[PDB]
Symmetry: D2
Subunit: 489 residues, 4 copies
Amino acid sequence: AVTFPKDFLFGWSQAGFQSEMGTPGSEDPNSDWYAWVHDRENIAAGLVSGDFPENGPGYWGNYRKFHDAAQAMGLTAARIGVEWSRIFPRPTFDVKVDAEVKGDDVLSVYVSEGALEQLDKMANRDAINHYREMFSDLRSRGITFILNLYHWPLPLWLHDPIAIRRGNLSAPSGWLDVRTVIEFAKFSAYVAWKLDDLVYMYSTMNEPNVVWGLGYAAVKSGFPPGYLCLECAGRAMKNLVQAHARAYDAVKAITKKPVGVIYANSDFTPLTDADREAAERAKFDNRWAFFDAVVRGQLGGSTRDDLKGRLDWIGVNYYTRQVVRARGSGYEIVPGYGHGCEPNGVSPAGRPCSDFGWEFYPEGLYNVLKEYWDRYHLPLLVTENGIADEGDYQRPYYLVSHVYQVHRALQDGVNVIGYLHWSLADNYEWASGFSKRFGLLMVDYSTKRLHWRPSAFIYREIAKSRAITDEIEHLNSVPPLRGLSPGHR
Amino acid sequence: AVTFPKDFLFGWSQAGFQSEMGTPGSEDPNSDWYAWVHDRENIAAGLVSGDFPENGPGYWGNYRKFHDAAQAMGLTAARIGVEWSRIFPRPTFDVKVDAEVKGDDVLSVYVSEGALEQLDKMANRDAINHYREMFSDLRSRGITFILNLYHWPLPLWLHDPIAIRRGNLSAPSGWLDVRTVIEFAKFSAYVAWKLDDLVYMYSTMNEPNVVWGLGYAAVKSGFPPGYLCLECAGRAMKNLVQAHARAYDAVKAITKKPVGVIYANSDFTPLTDADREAAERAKFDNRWAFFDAVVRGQLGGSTRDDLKGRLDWIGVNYYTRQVVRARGSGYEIVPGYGHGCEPNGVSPAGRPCSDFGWEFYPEGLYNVLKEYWDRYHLPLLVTENGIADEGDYQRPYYLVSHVYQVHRALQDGVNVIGYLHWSLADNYEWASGFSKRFGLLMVDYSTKRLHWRPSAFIYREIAKSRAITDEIEHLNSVPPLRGLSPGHR
Amino acid sequence: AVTFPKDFLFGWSQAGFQSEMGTPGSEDPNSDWYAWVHDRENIAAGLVSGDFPENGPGYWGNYRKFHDAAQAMGLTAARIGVEWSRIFPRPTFDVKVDAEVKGDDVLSVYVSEGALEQLDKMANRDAINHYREMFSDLRSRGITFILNLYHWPLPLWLHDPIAIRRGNLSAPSGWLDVRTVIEFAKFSAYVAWKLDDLVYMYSTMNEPNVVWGLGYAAVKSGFPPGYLCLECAGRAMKNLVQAHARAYDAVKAITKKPVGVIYANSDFTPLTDADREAAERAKFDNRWAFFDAVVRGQLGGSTRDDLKGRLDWIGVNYYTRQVVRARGSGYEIVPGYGHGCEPNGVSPAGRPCSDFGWEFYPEGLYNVLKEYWDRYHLPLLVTENGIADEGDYQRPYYLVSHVYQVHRALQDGVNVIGYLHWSLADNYEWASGFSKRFGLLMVDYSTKRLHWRPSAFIYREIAKSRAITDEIEHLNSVPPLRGLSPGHR
Amino acid sequence: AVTFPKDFLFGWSQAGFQSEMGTPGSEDPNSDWYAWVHDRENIAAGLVSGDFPENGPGYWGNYRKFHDAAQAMGLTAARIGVEWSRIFPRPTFDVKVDAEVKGDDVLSVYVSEGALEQLDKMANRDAINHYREMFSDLRSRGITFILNLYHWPLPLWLHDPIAIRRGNLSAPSGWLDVRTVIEFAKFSAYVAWKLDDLVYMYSTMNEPNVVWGLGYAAVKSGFPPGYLCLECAGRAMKNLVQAHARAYDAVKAITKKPVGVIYANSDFTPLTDADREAAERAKFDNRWAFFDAVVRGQLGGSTRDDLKGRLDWIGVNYYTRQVVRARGSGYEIVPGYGHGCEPNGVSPAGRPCSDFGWEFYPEGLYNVLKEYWDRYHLPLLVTENGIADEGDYQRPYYLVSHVYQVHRALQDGVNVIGYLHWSLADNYEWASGFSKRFGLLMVDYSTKRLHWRPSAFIYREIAKSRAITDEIEHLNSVPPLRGLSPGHR
Ligand code: NA
Ligand code: NA
């Protein structure tokens, strides 16, 4: 068997927007992402799927049954998001805080108790009370709670993504506006102040790199505001860095619990040995630039004491690799591997690809954990790992293989404190809608019933034993190719 | 949930030759099938895989661990074969019995206690003692035992399949020789006399239709003796009919426990409504001819009182359908469906096909059960159902779907007493060797370790609950096609 | 054999931007499309392929060899475009014309001889002289010349597509600016005045529906300006309508030769009989709205005498169908058929799909010809038909099948005057770059050599015989599926 | 261009049994192969396709139209077989010849003029006259005629393949009987005596290695007599060796024209460098053993002066490779490459596979030509090369690529005198029936009409120019994979 420490957390991760809606009274129309996915032009263009979150799995109303399944599966942790748009559907700009802003730089934001009380007057009571209700129930099952403050949607009062798509940059502009940083510090302080007693650890945000990169560079992804603007991507990145740091400080002024960040990762692997330097450039550009900012204070060639040391733990999201080849002194991501594969194809390495076109590459999780550990030596939590797999064809192998790699990291001395699968149940996969199914549990979106895929039973074995048991270790292997789609050659 | 009666048996089936060998001291070289699969000409022709049973899963030595897994899975029954070649590696012809033989017809075989004692003197002691040991352990787990007397291999002294392949029909000729019928009655009496205290129910033989049909007609299958001879097929069929009847009588002279037969089935479905009569002809020719003989005494246009009423229960093996189309007043099996599909392809009905090229068609199990019930109203046991599936891609759906159909049969009044999956573990699939993997448990043929596929955990849910539980009912559905091989169009 | 009239034209069509560049001295950087495909953000987003036209097949320099191949193939006609950006790389706004503009409506544009002389002073001499040189050579081979004035790129002084993408709608805005209509009338008059002696028939423009629809609605296509704006699509459509009418009048003031238009078509086929009305709505919205404007003067619910009767012939481009299903009182295009298929897949109708994901549907060409004929009874020319097919797998069948359908139309009384394949040679396929290969001739983009695919030899048979000969009629059939990619199911 | 010598022959090869029947009056029921393919047991087993030759392409009646197409294609040679079963449907045993037989060895057979006259009295006049008629017409088109005496079927009086399949080895036993050698010498002498004036070169037999190997070893191929017997394979091989030598001598006693043999070849390529010796063993066992016998007189370790020097030219048939890996001091053919691939799959080398599962490997034709040349330095004729390809997907590339390799051999000094494609038209592919379509011309088996595939037009280019012209040289390349079936991985 492959045995984990007694205190190692097995659980799941979940986003508010992706999972909450679907039950009566849950609809939240007040976010940029809601507007974005309902926008007729976006639907007609195929930027978004045409599926809508309000037809989703209904965690808002049915949380007890999600928690029942998690408890039955032996899970001991959950990272779940709260939605800013639910808690502050109306603007909080008028709440005075003590901020130092020098042009583009937000160096401090102090949120007084008076400000928290004013925020409480503005907050949506049903929302914050309901979050307490859900997370209280979660805790009642023996499940430790990691609260993630931000998982992409913004209140519409902060971001009109359609106006921005259209190039009206004077409209509310989300992460292009330093004001969003200050408002986020306010929000973060408020939520900690309200909910801290339920929380084990905090994450300020999830995959900010996806927000800046898909929002403003990889616009065919269909993410808001879909305004093709590399300078905007950089501005958003910096504001997300600053938002993280200012949220960290705001939360720390309320609680001393660990405050971290969750980030989207790939293992950047060189196509050939000659591409090793190119792979290193890719790691820096796509990963270290953000973490060097929030850990070491290093941003854009300058060091900021207000950014340094603003991280207690790192949430590693990992799905697959990106293969890199040198292109002059730059680099390029090689199609056909990693994230860039044919849906339900096979890479040139002989690795099957998911329903999303993501290559089976569990080794990359070890590499990414090791690399973050060696660089910063901050505690790591695998905050997402999973697969879009409607048939549960690859998922059993994917699960076991990736868990094994976490164990390997641990054996080599990486302080990884848990593994959170994405996700407990199927949910609304952003611009792709419902057809990308990442659950251990299948969701019937008509009935809202949860259904156990066989992988869920495998995960129960792991979580209850805190081990890859002898019975299931064989799943630490690549899915046999013959029975799977071959893709195209 | 889909709930079964309290006394309904969930278990597995297993053959001696397919599963026993692989551990030191287990090798049995004294069968036609052993000779057949080691024959250099057959190997070179690709008639047989070149894999050998002596490299198999090792039930002979490792039975306790098979039983441990079955007990852990909640299984309550097993149908397991004994090998005639192990028990009587030397000829028993000289043991006198009271038989009435009129040309091709064996009308009676009475095996006296003197004959049983003489047989006991000739029997391989290690073999019979070891069978008692294995089956005693099986019973000690709360597993009811259905003993199947014959599952294809014959002692070499009864059948030299290479000599027969070569057309030397004066060599020992297996089921072409009426003497084999008499020897089988002797064998059957002996085994019942020795082992009855361990047995719940008996089956005389397994899939005799495969023996006659693959042996002498469908010779590309690579089954012994591979002597293309339709008249021989008919002779073998009749002798298997007579062997069943004479074994039934011999066993009944020793024990009053139920004695049945296990047979290979397909649902014969008409391609179009115009093919309904053709499908009925196919059912008669391939199924009813045998059962009308051993139930109703009707064989070849004549009725035999020595054949009538020689059946207490029917073991239904079922894997897939055969699609039938009329061809004049005859019929033909349509390629691309049923047993005749592309390995890991998809039929024109949109049903995925297994590693063996067998179509996903759970509805056929209901139909076959219903049809046998309506015709004979004898108790039915699903004695085999499973899938060659190295990835466990289709098996979870296959399992649940077929179990559901058994429940449907029950609800409609069919007396089906249990469901036995083929198989607990991977084993030697005849001419195909080890590459066709039917287990709930994967076998590592190097280490002989058993490994739980996710389907095994699904089956544990079913067996322990005696139900398709709410958590797994969704698997009563067709595997999603997109992720699977499409085959060729 | 399937025999065509003696005067029926077999030829090819070709665009300037797609085919001209690739030889030294040919580069034309002064178009919106050039800027668009070189834009780093567009490249990084995958909106455009990253391939560049200046690496293309080099018709500008190598035209004689294209013409040699066409002449060897027996071709008797070519529709070839001229590029406005080459002829007027600097703005022509200052040239005074007599135009009546009432808000959004351009009711007349009269281009005097003084204006033509002023335009001649501004025109790029090398460009216009080189067009005369190329088209003179074309004519010297016995090839009749259909001149198409516009095939998507605009001079950069008329359209900064990057500024528009960014939402700076005060930048030069192409077909969003009524001034572009007037400038197009000037251009059209100039080219006719210069080149008329070489021209058999004129087309004002090619596939204006692609320009408005891909430019402003189907933005994932990666066409300029890629500004998602349905209102803009409508504005561009109207301006293209007006541009056509004003160009028609301007050309007719110089020459009485036939002036037509070339348009992108699909056969809109109903998924079920219940979708017939929905298919009719799709035809109107996607096809008749434009032609009713330029034939009948009907636009937006009002009739314009300045639009009525501005068409002498219709160029039918046709590649595949679109399957339509009713959606309430609207309709939707069904994925998996027509233009919306898996590249190198197979539709649910069993029709193979091209390298572009376009379904094999030759019957639609008959339907589209018949429908245009029945509605307007204007002479028809099949101005494009072809397939992206790097292996020449489907093309031989595609060619013969579609030619057959043209013959069927003719037999039923449609006045179709010729068939022009897209294309003689591989070329730059817009946002897809060079990897979509539509040639009868393969282009080696390194050497610029032309290579005859087997389909080219088939087309020689057709063109030289003016018939589908008995030897090749069998190619009027669907490509056999077994050897082709199956796609995914 | 790739230019061939002025006298280099481009043509086709054709078998009597495969192509003759299909027109009224052509049926020849008097051969082992006819009996074999009509045998109900063989049909039911799937040994044979169930298709029958009497439904074939009808060369017997329609030869003029085959010749018309060949002449239109510029072909200058044909190798066509005559059928012994047609010419001597009744036994010739009684015709006395002067033979020296020492047990298994036929050392001489002298056929006197008296014997030839007696044979003429026994010969089927219609048959021999019709062969003269067909071959006279062939010659009248400028087509040189290579007569092949034997192409597998035997008269039924010489071989009852069903009796042999059944193991009745006292029945007429074909190449297991030395008498067949003597009868073949008689036949060969007779045909030369009758037809010599029409013949340029003779071949005694075609692919005798297929006859012995498929007949008696690779019995799943469904070739007669399908009697699995390695000793019989060896006996048949020796008798075919002796038949060749005795036919050579008999024909040479009548004519001094060149007498050769046609043989089935593969390039035996080592999987890894470590397998080079194994590949050499495979070449000897499968190729050199036969040629060392008929060239060098070396057979079975002894040298026979009556076998030495009995070859004037070698007909190289070539379709694909066989990949070889060492297995101890022996070797094995690696599945997935060469002849052993998935139909319409792709090998691990990235080479597409035909409808027969044969890998695209043109390089092997060079290798095989070079190897035969270096060993024996006898003139070579590529007597077959082609592909089963119903869509003409791979054939254009296959044709050009293999012709190129012949040119390469020539450039390196191999005396290759021509290239004969298999085949002009589709025909009856033995146990596979009509579904394997090797023609440059497609045959409609209902109408018997011939249809030109595009490859036929490519071959016309080659044959008329005696060159791979600049226009078609690009087809010397591997078919692009994306559009083709990927097979399974
Ligand atoms: Na699975
Ligand atoms: Na082709």
